[PDB]
């Protein structure tokens, strides 16, 4: 099936639990499509910004899996303000910040913080995270789950 096909099932607000069946399927799909990365970030940005917490949560988990399964071609897309601004809008009180849940917000920050470490190459990711702090959105570096592959 198609990218949206996979994502829709992988982020369905009805799911009783995470369905890693579709999460991985969305990932390999991205790895097949000549424009999988470009298309995927756009799709993910939208799901992550959904008013339905469970949909955004699953979307974030899917985004996390793509970071580990879709290599550099995916990283490059995430490392752009085009996508990053969409995540900022989720935690920034100026935009969607005052409506999104603490669950979604902290998850997003955890990931951004994580990427500044794992992808020292992606300067835009650092600038994005740094702003969030300089703007009081993030009071301090959050603790994160142990993952030794984060270089």
């Amino acid at each position: 099936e198609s990218l949206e096909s996979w994502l829709n099932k992988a982020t369905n607000p009805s799911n009783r639990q995470e369905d890693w069946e579709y999460i991985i399927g969305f990932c390999d799909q991205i790895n097949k499509e000549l424009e999988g990365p470009q298309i995927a970030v756009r799709l993910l940005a939208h799901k992550i910004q959904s008013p339905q917490e469970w949909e955004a949560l699953q979307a974030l988990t899917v985004l996390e899996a793509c970071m580990k399964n879709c290599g550099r071609r995916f990283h490059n897309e995430v490392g752009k303000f085009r996508f990053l601004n969409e995540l900022i809008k989720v935690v920034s009180p100026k935009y969607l910040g005052d409506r999104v849940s603490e669950k979604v917000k902290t998850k997003v920050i955890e990931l951004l913080y994580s990427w500044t470490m794992a992808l020292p190459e992606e300067a835009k990711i650092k600038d994005a995270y740094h702003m969030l702090k300089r703007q009081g959105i993030v009071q301090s570096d959050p603790p994160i789950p142990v993952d030794r592959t984060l270089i």
Binding site: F81, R82, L84, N85, I88, A128, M131
Partner: peptide, 5 residues
């Protein structure tokens, strides 16, 4: 690509 928010 554009600029940061």
């Amino acid at each position: 690509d554009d600029h940061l928010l």
